[PDB]
């Protein structure tokens, strides 16, 4: 179980970033995470700032959705942000994380290409769905797989986005199934979320 966050929030230089965290029944805190650096809390109890955190960080919560706001987002604020709530059973549950980016080039929504299992693979008693995701910016996405219309989490592997030649990003995701699972469902889908956009592709057995 994770709290739902958008994978990517980005702004032009000068603009304010707003990051949401859904599914939280109690109070939320937020951590700034950068590669190779100690994470640090920026907001706790929904909107309270610890000492040393600049005024431009603020927060709000309404019902089960918390928001982190960063006014006049600066280069130093570029990072992944994770929300957190307490949980009776798991003690702590965290969000999926949101990459905050100041745009160095225009936003670009992903192209998605989905391949079904090949006949050769099925003959080897295996089945792999292959979802290729390219030409997006900024470089963060969420990939969701569905069996018919129902989410599937098991057997999924997804790469971290990497920079392509054209200076945009690409990623891939794979779903492992048994041939029986492949053949017995109406269809499987790969759905990619990026900023305001979702792109879904669907394939079905023949």
């Amino acid at each position: 179980y994770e709290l739902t966050q958008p994978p990517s929030v980005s702004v032009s230089p000068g603009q304010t970033a707003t990051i949401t965290c859904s599914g939280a029944s109690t109070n939320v805190c937020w951590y700034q995470v950068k590669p190779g650096q100690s994470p640090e809390v920026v907001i706790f109890e929904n909107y309270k700032r610890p000492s040393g955190i600049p005024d431009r960080f603020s927060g709000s919560k309404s019902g089960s959705t918390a928001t982190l706001t960063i006014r006049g987002t600066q280069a130093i604020d570029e990072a992944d942000y994770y929300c957190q709530v307490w949980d009776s059973f798991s003690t702590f549950v965290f969000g999926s994380g949101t990459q905050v980016t100041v745009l160095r080039q225009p936003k670009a929504n992903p192209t998605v290409t989905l391949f079904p299992p090949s006949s050769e693979e099925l003959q080897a008693n295996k089945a792999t769905l292959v979802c290729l995701i390219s030409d997006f910016y900024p470089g963060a996405v969420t990939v969701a797989w569905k069996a018919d219309s129902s989410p599937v989490k098991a057997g999924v592997e997804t790469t971290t986005p990497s920079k392509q030649s054209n200076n945009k990003y690409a990623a891939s995701s794979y779903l492992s199934l048994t041939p029986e699972q492949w053949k017995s469902h109406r269809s499987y889908s790969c759905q990619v979320t990026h900023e305001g956009s979702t792109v879904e592709k669907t394939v079905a057995p023949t």
Binding site: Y31, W86, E120, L132
Partner: protein
């Protein structure tokens, strides 16, 4: 003023025990739940467990049974041991602290910088190569994607070319994923004019030097 330092990053052999330590500098070892968390692509940020100076522990239900944490209150150090690791336990591991008391509003402080622990397989395995066939459907002036799936190999890397290097435009080979098994897979796809299907032959050439294997696979339109 209080800084936590984790033992460096390392590799652990799949099936063995992951072992980390965190050294605390500044403050006291009392009044605190000394904590471990981890961060990975496949499971995001997860709390693992904590320990109070008395030695009392609390562990994530998800790991209960194969995790253990201990503390040395004079050496100002605490440990994480995780048994029977698989590829899925590859992550950046963090130590941090929580104030003793009610946790509903609590947040982690004094995080360490994190240590990447990679759980790795041991034995070489060459890939299977499966075609990713394009449709034979006709787009008026459009493109088709076709590719090769390079499945279940170890260790990295694999290289892929098309038509023995003669085809380079429209080629995109994606970085590999690591499966729970500890084996890698990747895909290479080429975008071609949809009209070239049935005219131009497309063969992917896959090299896996560690297993001294090369595979050539022609990729044809779905029959």
């Amino acid at each position: 003023q209080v800084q936590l330092q984790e033992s460096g990053p390392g590799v652990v052999k799949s099936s063995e025990t992951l072992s980390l330590t965190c050294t605390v500098s500044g403050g006291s070892m009392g009044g605190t739940y000394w904590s471990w968390l981890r961060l990975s692509p496949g499971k995001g940020l997860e709390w693992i467990g904590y320990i109070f100076h008395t030695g009392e522990t609390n562990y994530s239900p998800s790991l209960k049974g194969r995790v253990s944490i201990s503390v040395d209150t004079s050496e100002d150090q605490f440990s994480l041991r995780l048994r029977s690791v698989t590829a899925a336990d590859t992550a950046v591991y963090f130590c941090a602290s929580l104030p003793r008391g009610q946790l509903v509003n609590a947040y982690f402080r004094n995080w360490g910088r994190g240590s990447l622990v990679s759980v790795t397989a041991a034995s070489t395995k060459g890939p299977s190569v499966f075609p990713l066939a394009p449709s034979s459907k006709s787009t008026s002036g459009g493109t088709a994607a076709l590719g090769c799936l390079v499945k279940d190999y170890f260790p990295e890397p694999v290289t892929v070319s098309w038509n023995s290097g003669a085809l380079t435009s429209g080629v995109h080979t994606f970085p590999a994923v690591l499966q729970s098994s500890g084996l890698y897979s990747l895909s290479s796809v080429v975008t071609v004019p949809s009209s070239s299907l049935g005219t131009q032959t497309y063969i992917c050439n896959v090299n896996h030097k560690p297993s001294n294997t090369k595979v050539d696979k022609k990729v044809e339109p779905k029959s």
